[PDB]
Design a protein around this ligand. Sequence first.
Ligand SMILES: [Zn+2]
Length: 257
Amino acid sequence: HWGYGKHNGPEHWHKDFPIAKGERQSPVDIDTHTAKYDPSLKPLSVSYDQATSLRILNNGHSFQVTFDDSQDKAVLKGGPLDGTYRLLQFHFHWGSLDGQGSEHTVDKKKYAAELHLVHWNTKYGDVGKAVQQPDGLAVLGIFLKVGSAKPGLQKVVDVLDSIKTEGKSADFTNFDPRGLLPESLDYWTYPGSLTTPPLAECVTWIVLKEPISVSSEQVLKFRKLNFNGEGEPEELMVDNWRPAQPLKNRQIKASFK
Ligand SMILES: [Zn+2]
């Protein structure tokens, strides 16, 4: 029922999901002058060499690439995290225009899109159990700006015409998510939530400072996806982002000076 329209969008979600007005909701604005460097943040470890991608799918809200998480293969460790977090899926949020689309903002700046690499804490055994825990998930968020093409994104963009509508999926094996990462792993971190229903307060957010550049042609392909299913009225999948939520009693910590 929920979505991103006038009558079912983020301002309505609290009726079915009262945690929408909770104490650790995401996304947030990252005020760069107020975020404090934390020298105790240990090294961040993105180990994606053995990643096994499986499928790409349009779920009616975004598109996602799924991974085999039945073994420690592609894992996130270090930084603010205790333990090992397995990569389950990545997806994006994007805008109808280049000046909006990201969920997190940086000094109120919106990027054209935001990539979320979603990982879950193996101490909880499965992702469903992890989402019930305050430290169950770790999401690596990466901003996209429009400029030069990202070569490591093109394989994704070229298959989107095959998953145009909600419920479509395709094989998407042998995709290397290392090709979506910027050079620097400098990051901000804070405790937050899923940015879609159920809005569970289970996420350690790790937002990279360095955006990746994608081309206008790449993002235009995102914008031709559909929220609707096949054989229904076409509503373009654009502006599938939740706006910044109140920071409340939280501090955003920086890994860098
Ligand atoms: Zn997301």
